[PDB]
Structures are given as structure tokens and as C-alpha cells.
């Protein structure tokens, strides 16, 4: 069957800001098979921005 | 059968902000098969932004 | 059968903000097969943003 | 059979804010097969944002 | 049979805020097959935001 | 048979806030097959937000 | 069947800003099979920009 | 079947700014099979630019 | 079947700025099979430019 | 089937600025099989330019 | 006061399978402030696995 | 006062399977502030697995 | 006071399989402030795996 | 006070497989402020793997 | 006070396979402020692997 | 106070395979402010590998 | 206070394979402010490799 | 206070293979402000390699 | 305070193969402000190599 | 305070093969402000090599 769409906007303004399809902020920390005499830290940061 | 849609907006303004399809903030911490004499910390941060 | 829709909004403004399809903030902490003489901590943070 | 819908809003404003399809904040803590002489803590935080 | 709906709102404003389809805040804590001489704690927090 | 609905609201304002389809805050604590000489605690918190 | 679309916007202005198809900020830290007498830290930062 | 589209915008202005198809900011830090008597840090930064 | 598109914009102005198909900012730091008595740091920066 | 496109823009002005197909800013730092009694640092910078 | 525990198992085998700290399968369906001339269904499924 | 426990099991085998700390299967269905001319259904299923 | 634990297992084998700290499978379906002349369905599935 | 732990396992074999700290499979479907004359479906699947 | 741990395993073999700190599989589908005369579907799949 | 750990394993073999700190597979599909007379689908797949 | 660790493994073999700190597979599909008379699909695949 | 670590492995062999600090496979597809009478597809693949 | 580490491995062999600090495989496809009467596809592949 | 490290390996052999600090394989395809009556494809391949 037929499909009809009449789109009549006047001055449509559309914003897509600070968006992501997929975002991952991970960390694998620790000995990982080695010999460490210190602290292992990891701070991955992800920021989509302000305004 | 037929399908009809009449769309008549006047000045429609649409905002999509600070949005994600999928967001993951994970961490795997600890010995992980190694020999550590210290602290292992991990602070993954994810922020979608203010306004 | 036929399907008809008449959409007549005047100045419709729509906001989608600070939203996620799926959000996960997890952590796997501990010995994980290793030999640790310290504390293992993990603080994954996820924030959708203020306003 | 036919289906008809007449939508006549005037200035409809709609907000979707701070919403998630699915949100999970979990943690698996403890020895996990390893030998630890310290505390293992984990504080995953998830925040949808204020206003 | 036919189905008809006449929708005539004037200035309808609708808010969906701080809502989730499914929310889970869990934790699996303890020895988990390992040998620990310390405390294992876990405080997963989930917050939908104030206003 | 036919079904008719006439919807005539004037300035309808609707709020859905701090709501979840399903919410779970659980914890599995204890030895879990391991050997622990300390306390295992777990305090999963879920908060839908104030106002 | 036929498909028809009439698009009649007047002065439509559309913005896509600060967006990513996929974003990852990860880190693998620790002994990694080596012998370290110091701290190993890693702070990968990703920022989508302000406004 | 036939497909028809009539596009009639008048002065459409479109902006794509500060966007990436895929962005990765990672780091692999630690002994990596070597013998280090110092700290190994790594701070990969990625910035999409302000406005 | 036939496909027809009538494109009638008047003064369309389009901007693509500060965008990348794929961006990677990584670093592999540490002993890497050698003998170091100092700190190894690495700060790869990638910037898409302001405005 | 036939495909037809009528493109009628009047004064279309298009800008592509500060864009890259693929951008990589990496660094491999550390002993790398050698004997160093100093710090090895590396700061690769990539900048797409302001405006 | 003193606390003593003598644990002498011989070949203890322990299984933790198909378990979750917290599981939620929810759905928010319906108009949600919009104008729909069709059915909205949602069937979120969660399965812990067979054996 | 002193507390003593002598645990002498021989070949203790323990199974924890198909268990959850907290399980929720909910659904919020209906108009939810919108105008629908169709059925809204929702069938969230949760299954802990067979054997 | 003193705390003593003697752990003497012989060939202890421990399995943790198909387990999650927190699992959420949610969906928000419906008009969501838009004008749809079709069905919106959503079937998020989560599976912990068989054996 | 003093804390002592004697761990004497002989051939302990421990498996952690198909496990996640936090898992989320969500979907936000529907008009989302737009004008659609078709079905919008979404089937996010998450699988922890068989055996 | 002093803390002592004697770890004496003989041939301990430990496996961590198919595990994630945090996993998210989400999708935001629908009009998203645009005018579509077709179906929008999205099937994000995440698989931790078999054995 | 002093902390002592005696680690005496003989032939310990440890495997970490097919694991991620954080994994996200998302998709944002639909009109996104544009005028489409076709189907928009998106199937992001993530696989941790078999064995 | 003093901290002492005696690590005495004999032939320890450790494998880290097919692992990522953070993995993201996303896609943003649809009109994106343009006028399309065709299908827009996107299938980003990420694979950690078999064995 | 003093910190001491005695590492005495005999023939330790360690493998790190097919691993990434951060991996992203994304795609932004669609009109992107242009006028297309064809299909736009994009299949970014990332593979960590078999064995 | 003093820090001491005695590293005594005999024939340690360490492999780092097929690894990346950060990997990105992205694509931006579509009209991009132009007028196309054909299909635009893009298949960026990244492979870390087999064995 | 003093820091001391005694490294005594005998015949240590270390391999770093097929590794990159940062790898990017991207593509920007489409009209890009031009008028094309053909297909624009792009297949950037990056391979780290087999063994």
C-alpha cells in the first residue's frame, strides 16, 4: 500500500550536542603477572563537555 | 492499506543533549596473577556534562 | 485498512537531556589470582550531568 | 478497519531528562582466588544528575 | 470497525524526569574462593538525582 | 463496532518524576567458598531522588 | 507500493556538536610481567569540548 | 514501487563541529617485562575543542 | 522502481569543522624489557582545535 | 529502474576545516631493552588548529 | 578474647553458578507525552542460563 | 571469652546455583501523559535458569 | 584479642561461573514526545550463558 | 591484637568465568520528539557466553 | 597489631575468562527530532565468548 | 604494626583471557533532525572471542 | 610499620590474552540534518580474537 | 617504615597478547547535512587477532 | 623509609605481542553537505595480527 | 629514604612484537560539498602482522 508523509515545519531548529553512540571508561589495574613494590592507580576520565 | 501522516509544526525546536546510547564505567582491580606490596586503586569517571 | 494521523502542533519544543540507553558502573576487585599485601579499591563513577 | 487520529496541540513542550533505559551499579569484591592481606573495597556510583 | 480519536490539548506541557526502565544496585562480596586476611566491603550507590 | 474518543483538555500539565519500572538492591555476602579472617559487609543503596 | 514524502521546512538550522560514534578511555596498569619498585599511574582523559 | 521525495528548504544552515567517528585514549603502563626503579606514568589526553 | 528526489534549497550553508574519522591517543610506558633507574612518563595530546 | 535527482541550490557555501581522516598521537617510552639512569619522557602533540 | 578456627577440609569443591547480586527487568511503556497511532510493546528478558 | 571452632569435613561439596540477592520484574504501562490510539503491552520476564 | 585461622584444604577446586554483581534489562518505549504512526517495540535480552 | 592466617592448600584450582561486575541492556524507543511513519524497534542483546 | 599470612599452595592454577568490569548494550531509537518515513531499528549485541 | 606475607606457590599458572575493564555497545538511530525516506538500522557487535 | 613479602614461586607462567582496558562499539545513524532517500546502516564490529 | 620484597621465581614465563589499552570502533552515518539518493553504510571492524 | 626489592628470576621469558595503547577504527559517512546520487560506504579495518 | 633494587636474571629473553602506541584507521566519505553521480567507498586497512 501507499505511504504518504507531508512535513511542513517552519523554522525548525534542532540541536544534537554532547552525545555519544557508545562510551566506555575502563581500567585493568594490579599485579598483572609482575612484581611491584608500589601503588598502581588508574583514573580514566571521560567528559562530554559542559553546554 | 494506505498510511497517511500530515505533520504541520510551526517553529519546532528540539534538543538532544548529554545523551549516550550505552555508557560503561568499569574497573578490574587486584593482584591479577602478580605479586604486589602496595595498594591498587582505580577510579574510572564518566561525565555527560553540565547543561 | 487505512491509517490517518493529522499532527498540528504550533511551536512544539522538546528536550531530551542527560539520558542513556544503558548505563553500567561495575567493578571486580580483589586478589584475582594474585598475591597482594595491600588494599585494592575501585570507585567507578558515572554522572549524567546537572541540568 | 480505518483508524484516525487528529492531534491538535498548541505550544506543547515536553521534557525527558535524567532518564535511563537500564542502569546497573554492581561490584564483585573479595579474594577471587587470590591471597590478600588487606582490605578490598569497591564503591561504584551512578548518578543521573540534579535537575 | 473504525477507531477515531480527537486530541485537542492547548499548551500541554509534560515532564519525564529522573526515571529508569530498570535499575539494579547489587554486590557480591566475600571470600569468593580466595584467602583474605582483611575486610571486604562494597557500597554500590545509584541515585536518580534531586529535582 | 466503532470506538470514538473526544479528548479536549485545556492546558494539561503532567509530571512523571522519580519513577522506575523495576528496581532491585541486593547483596550476596559471606564466605562464598573462600577463607576469610575478616568482616565482609555490603551496603547497596538505591535512591530515586528528592523532589 | 509507492512512498511519497513532501519536506517543506523554511530556514531549518541544525547543529551536531561535540559528538562521537564511539569513545573509549581505558588503561592497563601494573606489573605487566616486570619488576617495578615504584608507582605506576595512568590518567587517560577524553573531553568532547565545552559548548 | 516508486519512491518520491520533495525537499524544499529555504536557507538551511547545518553545522557539524567537534565530532569523531571513533575516539580512543588508552595507555598500557607498568613493568612490561623490564626492571624499573622509578615511577611510570602516562596521561594521554584527547580534546575535541571548545565551541 | 523509479526513485526521484527534488532538492530545492536556497542559500544552504554547511560547516564541517574540527572533525576526525578516527582519533587515537595512546601510550605504552614502562620497563619494556630494559633496566631503568628513572621515571618514564608519556603525555600524548590530541586537540581538534577551538572554534 | 531509473534514478533522478534535481539539485537546485542558490549560493550554497560549504566549509570543511580542521578535519582528518585518521589521527594518531602515540608514544612508546621506557627501557626498551637498554640501560638508562635517567628519565625518559615523550609528549607527542597533535593540533587541528583554531578556527 | 581470642578467637580460633581450625579448618581442615579434604578436597572441598564449591560451585557458584548462575547467580546475581541484584537483577531487574523493567519496562516503562505507553504514550509518555507523545502522540502514537500504534501499539507500543516491550519485552525485556533476563535469563541466568541453564545449568 | 575465648571462642573455638574445629571444622573437620572430609570432601565437602557445596553448590549455590540459580540464586539472586534481589530480583525485580516490573512494568509501568499506560497513557503516561500521552495520546495513544493503540494497545500498550509489556511482558518483562526474568528466569533463573533450569538446573 | 588475637584471631587465628588454620586453613588446611587439600585440592580445593572452586568455580564461579555465569554470575553478575548487578544486572538490568530495561526499556522505555512509547511516544516520548513525538508523533508516530507505527508500532514501537523493544526487546532487550540479557543472558548469563548455559553451563 | 594480632591476626594470623595459615593457608595450606595443595593444588587449588579456581575458575572465574562469564562474570560481570555490572551489566545493563537497555533501550529508549519511540518518537523522541520526531515525526515517524514507521516502526521503531530495538533489540539490545547481552550474552555472557556458553561454558 | 601484627598481621601474618602464610600462603603455601602447591600448583595453584587460576582462570579468569570472559569477564567484564562493566558491560552496557544500549540503544536510543526513534524520530529523535527528525522526519522519517521508514523503520528505525537497532540491535546492539555484546558477547563474552564461548568457553 | 608489622605486616608479613609468605607466598610459597610451586608452579602457579594463571590465565586472564577475554576480559575487559569496561565494554559498551550502543547505537543512536533515527531521524536525528533530518528527513529520511528509508530505514535506518545499526547493529554494533562486540565479541570477546571464543576460548 | 614494616611490611615484608616473601615471594617464592617456582616456574610461574602467567597469560594475559585478548583483554582490553575499555572497549566501545557505537554508531550514530540517521538523517543527521540531511535529506536521504535511502537506507543508512552501520555495523561496527569489535572482536578480541579466538584463543 | 621499611618495605621489603623478596622475589624468587625460577623460570617465570609471562605472555601479554592481543590486548589494548582502549579500543573504539564507531561510525557516524547518514545525511550529515547533504542530499543523498542512495544508501550510506559503514562497517568499521576491529580485530585483536587469533591466538 | 627504606624500600628494598630482591629480584631473582632464572631464565624469565616475557612476550608482549599484538598490543596497542589505543586503537580506533571509525568512519563518518553520508552526504556531508554534498549532493550524491550513489551509495557511500566505508569499511575501515584494523587487525592486530594472528599469533 | 634509600631505594635499592637487586636484579639478578639469568638468560632473560624478552619480545615486543606487532605493537603500536596508537593506531587509527578512519575514513570520511560522502558528498563533502560536491556533486557526485557515483559511489564513494573507502577501505582503510591497518594490519600489525602475523607472528
UniProtKB/Swiss-Prot annotation, chains A, B, C, D, E, F, G, H, I, J, K, L, M, N, O, P, Q, R, S, T:
The keyword Disulfide bond applies. The keyword Disulfide bond applies. One of its GO terms (biological process) is learning or memory. GO terms for molecular function: amyloid-beta binding; aspartic-type endopeptidase inhibitor activity; copper ion binding; cupric ion binding; cuprous ion binding; glycosaminoglycan binding; identical protein binding; microtubule binding. It is found in: Cell membrane; Golgi apparatus. Its main location: membrane. Keywords: Amyloid, Cell cycle, Cell membrane, Copper, Disulfide bond, Glycoprotein, Golgi apparatus, GPI-anchor, Growth arrest, Lipoprotein, Membrane, Metal-binding, Prion, Repeat, Signal, Zinc. One of its GO terms (cellular component) is terminal bouton. Monomer and homodimer. Has a tendency to aggregate into amyloid fibrils containing a cross-beta spine, formed by a steric zipper of superposed beta-strands. Soluble oligomers may represent an intermediate stage on the path to fibril formation. Copper binding may promote oligomerization. Interacts with GRB2, APP, ERI3/PRNPIP and SYN1. Mislocalized cytosolically exposed PrP interacts with MGRN1; this interaction alters MGRN1 subcellular location and causes lysosomal enlargement. Interacts with APP. Interacts with KIAA1191. Interacts with ADGRG6. It is linked to Found in high quantity in the brain of humans and animals infected with degenerative neurological diseases such as kuru, Creutzfeldt-Jakob disease (CJD), Gerstmann-Straussler syndrome (GSS), scrapie, bovine spongiform encephalopathy (BSE), transmissible mink encephalopathy (TME), etc. The normal, monomeric form has a mainly alpha-helical structure. The disease-associated, protease-resistant form forms amyloid fibrils containing a cross-beta spine, formed by a steric zipper of superposed beta-strands. Disease mutations may favor intermolecular contacts via short beta strands, and may thereby trigger oligomerization. Contains an N-terminal region composed of octamer repeats. At low copper concentrations, the sidechains of His residues from three or four repeats contribute to the binding of a single copper ion. Alternatively, a copper ion can be bound by interaction with the sidechain and backbone amide nitrogen of a single His residue. The observed copper binding stoichiometry suggests that two repeat regions cooperate to stabilize the binding of a single copper ion. At higher copper concentrations, each octamer can bind one copper ion by interactions with the His sidechain and Gly backbone atoms. Its primary physiological function is unclear. May play a role in neuronal development and synaptic plasticity. May be required for neuronal myelin sheath maintenance. May promote myelin homeostasis through acting as an agonist for ADGRG6 receptor. May play a role in iron uptake and iron homeostasis. Soluble oligomers are toxic to cultured neuroblastoma cells and induce apoptosis (in vitro). Association with GPC1 (via its heparan sulfate chains) targets PRNP to lipid rafts. Also provides Cu(2+) or Zn(2+) for the ascorbate-mediated GPC1 deaminase degradation of its heparan sulfate side chains. Belongs to the prion family. This is Major prion protein.
Amino acid at each position: 500500500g501507499t505511504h504518504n508523509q507531508w512535513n511542513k515545519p517552519s523554522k525548525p531548529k534542532t540541536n544534537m550536542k554532547h552525545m555519544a553512540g557508545a562510551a566506555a571508561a575502563g581500567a585493568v589495574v594490579g599485579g598483572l603477572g609482575g612484581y611491584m613494590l608500589g601503588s598502581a592507580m588508574s583514573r580514566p576520565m571521560m567528559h562530554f563537555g559542559n553546554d
